[PDB]
Amino acid sequence: IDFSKPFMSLGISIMIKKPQKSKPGVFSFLDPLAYEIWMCIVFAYIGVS
Amino acid sequence: NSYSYGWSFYFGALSFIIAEMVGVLAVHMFIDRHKQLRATARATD
Numbered sequence: 001i002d003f004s005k006p007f008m009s010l011g012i013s014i015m016i017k018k019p020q021k022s023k024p025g026v027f028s029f030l031d032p033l034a035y036e037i038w039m040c041i042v043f044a045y046i047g048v049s
Numbered sequence: 050n051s052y053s054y055g056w057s058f059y060f061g062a063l064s065f066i067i068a069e070m071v072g073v074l075a076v077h078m079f080i081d082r083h084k085q086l087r088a089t090a091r092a093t094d
């Protein structure tokens with residue numbers, strides 16, 4: 001068959017069952033700072049003392 | 050964009066803790082030495 005020009009644009013895509021929103025972790029209070037900062041604070045605490 | 054520090058990174062970090070502990074132990078030896086040296090000197094006086 002003689003196709004014509006694309007009237008719209010598509011593309012293969014993965015569909016999954018929308019995973020319900022998660023609950024903040026038990027240790028979520030460490031989230032505001034990166035793991036590197038917490039590691040360095042411990043080093044600073046030991047170094048200063 | 051993920052990464053994970055390896056054992057080599059954790060060897061330098063572990064070295065920092067050991068080095069600081071040795072520093073405390075070295076200062077405590079300097080403190081103890083002088084305390085013994087002063088105690089003996091006072092007793093002789």
Ligand SMILES: NS(=O)(=O)c1cc2c(cc1Cl)N[C@H]([C@H]1C[C@H]3C=C[C@@H]1C3)NS2(=O)=O
Nearest residue numbers: 002003004005006007008009010011012013
């Ligand atoms: N944005 S979209 O998917 O709605 C969409 C996508 C396309 C449209 C028109 C729309 Cl509205 N027309 C173009 C067509 C116009 C000329 C340029 C490319 C073909 C011929 N094909 S497309 O680039 O596949």
